Amino acid sequence: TYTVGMYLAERLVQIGLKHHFAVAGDYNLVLLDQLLLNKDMKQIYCCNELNCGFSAEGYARSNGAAAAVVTFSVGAISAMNALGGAYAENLPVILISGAPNSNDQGTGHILHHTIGKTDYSYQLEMARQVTCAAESITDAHSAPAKIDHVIRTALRERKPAYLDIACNIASEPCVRPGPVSSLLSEPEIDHTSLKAAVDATVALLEKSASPVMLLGSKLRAANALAATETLADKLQCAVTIMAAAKGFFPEDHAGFRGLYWGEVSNPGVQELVETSDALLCIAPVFNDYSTVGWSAWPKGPNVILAEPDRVTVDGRAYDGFTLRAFLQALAEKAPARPASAQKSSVPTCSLTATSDEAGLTNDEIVRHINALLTSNTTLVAETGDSWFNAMRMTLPRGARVELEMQWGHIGWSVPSAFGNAMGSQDRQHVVMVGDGSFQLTAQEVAQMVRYELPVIIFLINNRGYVIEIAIHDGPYNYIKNWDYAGLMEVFNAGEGHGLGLKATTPKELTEAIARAKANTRGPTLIECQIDRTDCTDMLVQWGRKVASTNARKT
Amino acid sequence: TYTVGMYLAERLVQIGLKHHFAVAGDYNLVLLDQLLLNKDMKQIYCCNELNCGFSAEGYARSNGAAAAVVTFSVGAISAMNALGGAYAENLPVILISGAPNSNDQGTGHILHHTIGKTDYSYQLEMARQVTCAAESITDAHSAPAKIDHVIRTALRERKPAYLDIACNIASEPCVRPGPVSSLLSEPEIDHTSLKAAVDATVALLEKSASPVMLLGSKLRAANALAATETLADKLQCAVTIMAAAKGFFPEDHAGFRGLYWGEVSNPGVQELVETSDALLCIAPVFNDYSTVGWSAWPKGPNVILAEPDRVTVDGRAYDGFTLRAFLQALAEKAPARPASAQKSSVPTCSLTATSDEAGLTNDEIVRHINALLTSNTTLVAETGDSWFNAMRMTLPRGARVELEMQWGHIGWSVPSAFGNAMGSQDRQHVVMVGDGSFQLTAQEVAQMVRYELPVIIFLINNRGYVIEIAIHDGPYNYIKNWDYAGLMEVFNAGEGHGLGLKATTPKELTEAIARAKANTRGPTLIECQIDRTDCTDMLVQWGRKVASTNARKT
Amino acid sequence: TYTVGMYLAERLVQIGLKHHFAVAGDYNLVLLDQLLLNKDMKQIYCCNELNCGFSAEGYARSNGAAAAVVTFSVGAISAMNALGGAYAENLPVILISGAPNSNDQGTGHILHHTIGKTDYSYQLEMARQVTCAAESITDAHSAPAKIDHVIRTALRERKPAYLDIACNIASEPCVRPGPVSSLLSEPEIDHTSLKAAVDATVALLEKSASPVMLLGSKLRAANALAATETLADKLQCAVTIMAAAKGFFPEDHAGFRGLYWGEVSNPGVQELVETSDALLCIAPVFNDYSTVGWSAWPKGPNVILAEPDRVTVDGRAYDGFTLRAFLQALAEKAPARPASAQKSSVPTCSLTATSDEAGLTNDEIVRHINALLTSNTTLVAETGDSWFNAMRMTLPRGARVELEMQWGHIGWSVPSAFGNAMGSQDRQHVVMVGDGSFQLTAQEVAQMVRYELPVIIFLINNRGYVIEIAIHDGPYNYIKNWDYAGLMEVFNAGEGHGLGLKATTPKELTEAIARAKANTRGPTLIECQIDRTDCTDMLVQWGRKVASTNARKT
Numbered sequence A, B, C: 001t002y003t004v005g006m007y008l009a010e011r012l013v014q015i016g017l018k019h020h021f022a023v024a025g026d027y028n029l030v031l032l033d034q035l036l037l038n039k040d041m042k043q044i045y046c047c048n049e050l051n052c053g054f055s056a057e058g059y060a061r062s063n064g065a066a067a068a069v070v071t072f073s074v075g076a077i078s079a080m081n082a083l084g085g086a087y088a089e090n091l092p093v094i095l096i097s098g099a100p101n102s103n104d105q106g107t108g109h110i111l112h113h114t115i116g117k118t119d120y121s122y123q124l125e126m127a128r129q130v131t132c133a134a135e136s137i138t139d140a141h142s143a144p145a146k147i148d149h150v151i152r153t154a155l156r157e158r159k160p161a162y163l164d165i166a167c168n169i170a171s172e173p174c175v176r177p178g179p180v181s182s183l184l185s186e187p188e189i190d191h192t193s194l195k196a197a198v199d200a201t202v203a204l205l206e207k208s209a210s211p212v213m214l215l216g217s218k219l220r221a222a223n224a225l226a227a228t229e230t231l232a233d234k235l236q237c238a239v240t241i242m243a244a245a246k247g248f249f250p251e252d253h254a255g256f257r258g259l260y261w262g263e264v265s266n267p268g269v270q271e272l273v274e275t276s277d278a279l280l281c282i283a284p285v286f287n288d289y290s291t292v293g294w295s296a297w298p299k300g301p302n303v304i305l306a307e308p309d310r311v312t313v314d315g316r317a318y319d320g321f322t323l324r325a326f327l328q329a330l331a332e333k334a335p336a337r338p339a340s341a342q343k344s345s346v347p348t349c350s351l352t353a354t355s356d357e358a359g360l361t362n363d364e365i366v367r368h369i370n371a372l373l374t375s376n377t378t379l380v381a382e383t384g385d386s387w388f389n390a391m392r393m394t395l396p397r398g399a400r401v402e403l404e405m406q407w408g409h410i411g412w413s414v415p416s417a418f419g420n421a422m423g424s425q426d427r428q429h430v431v432m433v434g435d436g437s438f439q440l441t442a443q444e445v446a447q448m449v450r451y452e453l454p455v456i457i458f459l460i461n462n463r464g465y466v467i468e469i470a471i472h473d474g475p476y477n478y479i480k481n482w483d484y485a486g487l488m489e490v491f492n493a494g495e496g497h498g499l500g501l502k503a504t505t506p507k508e509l510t511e512a513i514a515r516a517k518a519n520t521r522g523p524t525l526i527e528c529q530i531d532r533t534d535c536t537d538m539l540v541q542w543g544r545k546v547a548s549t550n551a552r553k554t
């Protein structure tokens, strides 16, 4: 006897999901039962719904998509924070909420977990604001069409979507889903437009002296990584990254020239791109953070703006094809233009070295983490100064970096890494998280313990919101210190294999990392103590400009 | 010097539009100027915005898509009625509104044509409710992406979309649009799913004794007319239509068996479909009107439900392909199953004949209009008793019928026929419209005069809302009578070539139609006077069941 | 046996309504039946829902509030245009929509008059955008609370509100409404705040040399007319009006000094207010039209901004009392400050006179209408050049002017006058309407005929959108001319007592007005033919500034 909930489960499996995340509530228990009957995936549990959503977000990063299941209102609303995050970071997370019994609809009944009015369509209205698709299932017959619609839309658009299922309907008989090639289907490509866009770009490139490539944070969502480095091989030119695109290109590569981020770029790089004859700008996200208060925002006649969906070049916009198809086709026809690469040096990064027994230093933490990175590593870098020393690392080919520079929700780090680890258990997972950020979502380290995930967490204890102290200080930047290392035993409670360690000197950190690598059955939190004054120059420079731009009066 | 408004114009032309409809207002004048610079289409004008929207709707029916341009709030809101209509009737109308100067945004300025508050995002929020896409253009740089998004989404989904352009931005420099194959692009078809759906349907058909085809009102939007009659040729079986699908299948055809509409079906037809071994139900819209108060709604194991997007057959749903591709593929493999056709008669319709000089009769009007219909005719039938004698006509192969049975906005008839005529000037356009409906939108007959469109309008003057009088009578059903024939000279005003005639007897109607056919440079309104008591039995039967179902207490 | 619909009816009667306006549809028929059972009011019918809404709006102007009843979506959406209008013009219109059977809710049924999806909460979401309160009645038990909430909120806020009643629920048993003092209840007045505001204003006035009063278009909604002229009697100072406040002060008065409207003010008046020591600015609406493109917008330390709700004077805002209470209290304590009045002349208006047999002239039309005005007259002036010669009339004490300068929906004129006449049948009703505007809503003159309302309509036929031709001309300004006078017989159809006359010379107009005054049982339309070139200088001046401001690039 095949139910609506089973239909949902089988479709999620067809997406390529092996896990979904959940927090139980009476509105979703039966739905959770239906999902559990599918042995092709595991149902894993979170502390709260905010973390649950961000766990799904992290999973989407490594798997391609994700699903989280919550209860009505009290669960769903906080998960909408994570949904908005998924939208901001171009990740197809599917949020499924339990919903009131369909027989309660239009009766004037007031229900628990509602704001106390006779109707309760407010949740769906809120969800629409942060999703590409949002449906409320209230009968078994229309359920398949709705489920299929949200999933297919989410995957095609690389955006999150929302689902309601009335609690009494999860159990209802339902037709079975058919076999599929894939649940992802892009629109059929417009060949007239593709040809014209490639021709126009080739023409501009041919008459150029020194083209540069600038890579943006939508490159992965556009599924355009391989196509990009193929194009880079053909062009021979300099390849640069925007901050949020770290790890989207192999730094091993002959053409890699480093970070473009306005005045905090690697030396020479600002001049490289700002002055380019033909800037091949691929999948960028230009906002107030990435353009450094609108001071570093390349546009106009010399820019080839190549977005996931469309290409703008030489005063014309060409639409109706995928970025991936454009980059593949362009690589066939593009000329060799090496001038940019041969006129510039491979990026290097100066890190000040200390002695063994000196107090631990920001630069010294970066030096130690850099040495940890392998081709099999995923580095998660939290909002705060961790953004900036993420930029300062030389990452080996194959290594992955995860940033959340568009949403920028502090605390994202922890549950995100948890989900990400679930979705790629074969990789080494490393987290950089500030003390302030950790406090928002700390409890999710307990899930890492529960599920025996060997994540290495570098907790940067500098005693407050330093990214804010350096830029605009006030009493609001100072938080209650915790014994972060001591928190691991609390989550262990005599069961788990989590480790909590203090690093107070470079010697003490070197020992802590050795212990961490040996801890195969649980997370390792290393509380790194550095002085509040000891942040990157990069942060100070970037912050001053951004803050004065956000405070602008005219 | 190429502007945002010119970009919009060139994209509309690429859709295949040769006309757009407009009402001027200060928020859209510059935009209208930009559109006028494109000689590939004509800008035509309407009396009011409700009519403007319905004109676009009518144009979409004959052309494939349409566009209407209105001013902020005072224009846009009433056009949203038509937009909802377009959504209901699966037509990609694009509504473009003029909007306040972008420099007024966030200033706290109160603007004219707004509700008087400091912000005015209320319009876009309302538009989202009735569209598949809705964007507000407030800068030139993001304008192309937004324009392209609404147009492409509208065409793919066969749903209307909405656009804002800030009045100061219509003039702004803009990149040019690239060449395209087509602005329509469906998602790439899932071949695993298609194969399994066709295989499952063929298996069910093979073991069937008498399959029937039932055609619904989404058949045209799914662009599935030719594929349907190809399938009908292969299957040899009985082909029946739902009310709203009149004209979607040639009544000339050997397999045509008439109307399925519950208890108001053609004799034998209800038994034919209700009792079928395997009901091939194609692109249906099952609502309270079409299912006749939920009494005639075929579903369950014996039904092959083939929707624009998906197919449900034998307890499985198959998604990820177009209806058209499904129907083409099914026609290759389907067996011959003629039992349904050879066990039933070609539908006939009994019409009572009167004498020349007797007072005009409902049946006699149908008889006269039926004789007018050619393969080159488009018949527009208004909500009211005109729905019912539209059903009662035998239409020659090629003839088109236009119904609005999902939205059902009285008055739609007139502006809709106007737009439809604009979009197919080579065809003969015939309108059936009640006296009550005509009063809502009458003024648009003046546009037909202005643009010299030879539409023949049969105004059925029965002195009120008869469809309502017959079912649930009250003082609200009785309206002020007009001299409808005399109204033509009013719109002529010594310029135009409109004709207004009274038909009071069958002889008098026969003469009026002769005059109408001869009137090549303007519309002809024939005020047909029939008694209030003289409506179809079909209406009474249908009405009683529907009304008692809508008044149901449990 | 007492029903939900009867409850609604009795509450409407308690508002002081004697009429409600309706268009029948199956979703509201039973509701209409319930309302008809209340003999304390009359149910009157409209051609379409846009006109229906604007009829209610007009009724609210003379009665204080109004109600319109429409059917779901197809009716309600276009009525939302009128609702937005009511919000803009501060009038408590209650729109009541019929809605689907409550048993259809949450079933996945598709219903007629919907966009075709399984749910249909889109209407309520749209209504919220343009109302102060919006409720959907879906059970009998919560119906009283909801009805009482929308009505009370509407009246308190002077804003429109929205109601849904499920069609099956109009008939349901319901408790009866209790007796009331009034359905209007403002919040209890804050006496600390009132005292401080009056004290601060008196202090500023006392040390002033020449205070001026400037009256705005919210004066009537604030129910502050009598209080204003009491204050003017005490202050002895100059009293000036904003355009939209015409008729809110007796021009008979010793202190009346005319129109303040930037550069189109009466001579000297701009200097009077712009230069005032202490500008008592009462219930103003400052928008781009009233401030003449932001060039005439008095603010800062010298301005006493007295709004319906709050007073800002000398760098402090005082809230928590009604404008009426503030003005009453201020009149007790205010000093005499006559300087502004004795330094300026009573406003006069130069009108050029022609001969009897010369072609009719704009100035000559104004001269004739001015002579018609009595203390018992209500003048309705449409958007267009009619705004401007409304300003140019000297109105006798007691005379009423109706303007719609915030919404500015052309066509408003006609249905608004109809409703207004219904709500004050004892008064003489005069309409000024342009030819372009008349075309949008013309059919509602048929209702005036039906209900035997002796409205005198001056149709200004200047052959297009002249207000637009003078400012920014293009093909979109030119419309199909009608025989406007001939349209009356069409609506009469041998029944009614409407008159249609042409005025082509001043003699011919003088005769037409004589006929109009004698026509006691129907409307009289006088088609006044003037040249397209013959608009007010006032319009040209005002238009040029406003248009260049709306087209501003920075």
Ligand SMILES: Cc1ncc(C[n+]2csc(CCOP(=O)(O)OP(=O)(O)O)c2C)c(N)n1
Pocket (backbone or CB within 6 Å): A383, A384, A385, A386, A408, A409, A410, A433, A434, A435, A436, A437, A438, A460, A462, A464, A465, A466, A467, A468
């Ligand atoms: C949910 C949320 N609240 C507030 C902020 C604003 N915010 C941005 S950074 C930041 C400080 C983070 O401090 P920490 O984790 O200690 O990193 P550090 O600056 O010390 O390196 C805050 C509070 C945010 N990004 N997200």
Ligand SMILES: Cc1ncc(C[n+]2csc(CCOP(=O)(O)OP(=O)(O)O)c2C)c(N)n1
Pocket (backbone or CB within 6 Å): B382, B383, B384, B385, B386, B408, B409, B410, B433, B434, B435, B436, B437, B438, B460, B462, B464, B465, B466, B467, B468, C023, C024, C025, C026, C049, C071, C074, C075
């Ligand atoms: C905008 C709108 N308002 C009201 C209705 C409700 N309605 C449906 S049929 C109908 C009667 C129209 O009668 P008429 O055009 O004279 O046709 P008849 O059946 O009398 O021949 C009405 C008022 C509607 N469908 N749409």
Ligand SMILES: Cc1ncc(C[n+]2csc(CCOP(=O)(O)OP(=O)(O)O)c2C)c(N)n1
Pocket (backbone or CB within 6 Å): B023, B024, B025, B026, B071, B074, B075, C382, C383, C384, C385, C386, C408, C409, C410, C433, C434, C435, C436, C437, C438, C460, C462, C464, C465, C466, C467, C468
């Ligand atoms: C519903 C609506 N549609 C469009 C407009 C834009 N508009 C403002 S004035 C105007 C012209 C009015 O023409 P008419 O009534 O003849 O005035 P006149 O010739 O005296 O200038 C138009 C179309 C509007 N204000 N409201």
Ligand SMILES: [Mg+2]
Pocket (backbone or CB within 6 Å): A434, A435, A436, A437, A460, A461, A462, A463, A464, A465, A466
């Ligand atoms: Mg910190």
Ligand SMILES: [Mg+2]
Pocket (backbone or CB within 6 Å): B434, B435, B436, B437, B460, B461, B462, B463, B464, B465, B466
């Ligand atoms: Mg009728």
Ligand SMILES: [Mg+2]
Pocket (backbone or CB within 6 Å): C384, C434, C435, C436, C437, C460, C461, C462, C463, C464, C465, C466
């Ligand atoms: Mg005019």
